[PDB]
Design a protein around this nucleic acid. Structure first.
Ligand SMILES: [Mg+2]
Ligand SMILES: [Mg+2]
Ligand SMILES: [Mg+2]
Ligand SMILES: [Mg+2]
Ligand SMILES: [Mg+2]
Ligand SMILES: [Mg+2]
Ligand SMILES: [Mg+2]
Ligand SMILES: [Mg+2]
Ligand SMILES: [Mg+2]
Ligand SMILES: [Mg+2]
Ligand SMILES: [Mg+2]
Ligand SMILES: [Mg+2]
Ligand SMILES: [Mg+2]
Ligand SMILES: [Mg+2]
Ligand SMILES: [Mg+2]
Ligand SMILES: [Mg+2]
Ligand SMILES: [Mg+2]
Ligand SMILES: [Mg+2]
Lengths: 129, 88, 218
RNA sequence: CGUAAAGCGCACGCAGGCGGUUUGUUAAGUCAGAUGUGAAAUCCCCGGGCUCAACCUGGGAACUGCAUCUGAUACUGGCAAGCUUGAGUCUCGUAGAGGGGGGUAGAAUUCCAGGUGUAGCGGUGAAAUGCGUAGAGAUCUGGAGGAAUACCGGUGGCGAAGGCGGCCCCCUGGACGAAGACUGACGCUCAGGUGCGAAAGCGUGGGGAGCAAACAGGAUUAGAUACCCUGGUAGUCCACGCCGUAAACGAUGUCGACUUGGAGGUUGUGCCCUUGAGGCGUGGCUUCCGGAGCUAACGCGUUAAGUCGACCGCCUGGGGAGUA
């Protein structure tokens, strides 16, 4: 059931991508957005778009560089069944540094490079590379 | 499974008006209606095991709905079960 | 823009999902390809095609079917170009080194047709040895001499030529090919939409390819 | 955890876990900093002392922890009030071996009665046992009774599973579709618990045509406690109540979202000179084939065994043992 949307996002992406699908949409939310943000701002998607009002609709434009998709792997990490939280010193780094980890902090949803520089930590929503 | 006349009658006896059809109280009451009706179908027969399944489904549906109301508006809950005559 | 009078598209169901981007069809139980997206594929098509033909064109107009074999042993055959118009003896690229002597037997025989031994031995051996040569001739004509190693490859019907194309992909050979709606692209580097087993789209583009190798740098 | 160990036979559901979307607030989880504390030894790093080393020793580092204070508010939790797509309710219809009860029909078998008719019938590989001169079998007519419903009939349909096929009425469950209207997260899952659950089997009473464990006879065979034959009891049928198991199998737990295609079957519904027995769409279910992908392979493949998440069940070498 709907129960975990954020994985559903991570997934609708993962999938469409593997389906060399141009765009991809889904029910939106404060949260979906903030991540679609980091995802664009870190250059894993072209650009997002939320087209509705009562029943908002996040829409992401996918990217493809060579022939490949740009997003080579996108996984949940925290989840309803099992929440993950890391302190600053204990934040994770994906692919040695390449690619990134989305972490939500008391100062908003930012990357790991980010939250690290911000000197704090929070819930590690997902990994991406 | 209950009449249009009958089901209507009760919407009109429990909701704001005919149309306020999905009002908690209403659902409960037109459920409660069919359950009781049925008591006699299963009085005779009794081996109608299959149909029995549907009836329980009615009871547990109603049960969950009753549970909802109570949490929401306790005031409305109590009135209901009195007026519907259950929860001994 | 268009030039293909009546090759429009072709091929009914049997359509290959991956061939959607070049389809605008839907006429009476059959796709018309996207005419207006084929021609931008003469651009690039005959371009890197020629861009090498002046760097020196070695080709292989590979295309078979007792229904267009001869129409390939043509000005397709004639120019800076080799060809195959019969059963693609599998491994003829990937095993050229074995096959290279299936050549020696062709020559060392016809070179000896109106020469060498010939009207001699028995009049059994006679046409009972020209059957050796006849057989060889088709499927191993166009090969004759391969002077400059097979360099690009131009194929009529992508999938019908499973093997040919495959070998290329394996040996790093450009493969220019036209792909009907039904066929699987991506085996083909330079892809050309539109019909691939009708007497026109052949000759047309076929003949038109002969026209760009046969002239690049005088 | 399809076929190797492993999905409970099926469902409903308490506790529990998890839970769409918006704004406010809370600050428990979470995060930040500060302070105290985290015995020494030990470990580790750099040294120093015993001829070296083990050994001894200086000083750091480390003790990933705990608590207090103050902060941060994205996520989670709490409180509040909403929201409409999740989930329900309502309206008219549609298909159906879905369930329960009662009624009823023709075809056959067995039996009873009678006409005609006469020496065999029946059965096997071949036989014999058996049946017939008290007239069999064969045929015809009338009658009794039980059991099951040919054709339709179909990788057809319904049900949670078990499983449900003549026809008719009554009672009744679920599913699906088309419009909009109402509720407003009322949801998902579910250890425990409760219900249902083929056949055989048990209890009391019926009922008994055919079939048939047991048992008897006849054969076959080296033997024949069998396979075959002639018989035939429980049982197979009804009511009431037990039992609770099956290769209860898709050997594939339930719910949700996402991801190229192709040819059927079945069932709703919108549009098109209905002007064709149709034309183009749009749901539910179903069979075959097949792409990525997955797989030890076989295979699966939008009805997943692909890609993800929520909860539950279960596996941890064979035998011993699903035994004590
Ligand atoms: Mg097993
Ligand atoms: Mg099961
Ligand atoms: Mg949310
Ligand atoms: Mg210490
Ligand atoms: Mg020393
Ligand atoms: Mg909150
Ligand atoms: Mg009779
Ligand atoms: Mg009779
Ligand atoms: Mg019904
Ligand atoms: Mg039971
Ligand atoms: Mg029984
Ligand atoms: Mg009995
Ligand atoms: Mg017997
Ligand atoms: Mg068992
Ligand atoms: Mg398949
Ligand atoms: Mg399909
Ligand atoms: Mg799955
Ligand atoms: Mg036991």
């Amino acid at each position: 059931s709907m129960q975990d949307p954020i994985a559903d996002m991570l997934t609708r992406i993962r999938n469409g991508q593997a389906a060399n699908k141009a765009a991809v949409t889904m029910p939106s939310s404060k949260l979906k957005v903030a991540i679609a943000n980091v995802l664009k701002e870190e250059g894993f998607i072209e650009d997002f778009k939320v087209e509705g009002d009562t029943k908002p609709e996040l829409e992401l434009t996918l990217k493809y560089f060579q022939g490949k998709a740009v997003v080579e792997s996108i996984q949940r990490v925290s989840r309803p069944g099992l929440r993950i939280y890391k302190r600053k010193d204990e934040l994770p780094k994906v692919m040695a540094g390449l690619g990134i980890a989305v972490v939500s902090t008391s100062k908003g949803v930012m990357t790991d490079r980010a939250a690290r520089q911000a000197g704090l930590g929070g819930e590690i929503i997902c990994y991406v590379a | 499974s209950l009449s249009t006349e009958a089901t209507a009658k009760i919407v009109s006896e429990f909701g704001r008006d005919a149309n306020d059809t999905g009002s908690t109280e209403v659902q409960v009451a037109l459920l409660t209606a069919q359950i009781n009706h049925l008591q006699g179908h299963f009085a005779e027969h009794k081996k109608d095991h299959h149909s029995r399944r549907g009836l329980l489904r009615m009871v547990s549906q109603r049960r969950k709905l009753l549970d909802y109301l109570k949490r929401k508006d306790v005031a409305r809950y109590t009135q209901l079960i009195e007026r519907l005559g259950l929860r001994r | 823009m268009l030039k293909a009078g009546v090759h429009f598209g072709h091929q009914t169901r049997y359509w290959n999902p991956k061939m959607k981007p070049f389809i605008f069809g839907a006429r009476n139980k059959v796709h018309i390809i996207n005419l207006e997206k084929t021609v931008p594929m003469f651009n690039e098509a005959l371009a890197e095609l020629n861009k090498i033909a002046s760097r020196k064109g070695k080709i292989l107009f590979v295309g078979t079917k007792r229904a267009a074999s001869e129409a390939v042993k043509d000005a397709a055959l004639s120019c800076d170009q080799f060809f195959v118009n019969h059963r693609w003896l599998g491994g003829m690229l990937t095993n050229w080194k074995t096959v290279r002597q299936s050549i020696k037997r062709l020559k060392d025989l016809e070179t000896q047709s109106q020469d060498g031994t010939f009207d001699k031995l028995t009049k059994k051996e006679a046409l009972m040895r020209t059957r050796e040569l006849e057989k060889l001739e088709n499927s191993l004509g166009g090969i004759k001499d391969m002077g400059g190693l097979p360099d690009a490859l131009f194929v009529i019907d992508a999938d019908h030529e499973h093997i040919a194309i495959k070998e290329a992909n394996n040996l790093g050979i450009p493969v220019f090919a036209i792909v009907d709606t039904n066929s699987d692209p991506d085996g083909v580097d330079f892809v050309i939409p539109g019909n691939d087993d009708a007497i026109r789209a052949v000759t047309l583009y076929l003949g038109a390819v002969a026209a760009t190798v046969r002239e690049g740098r005088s």
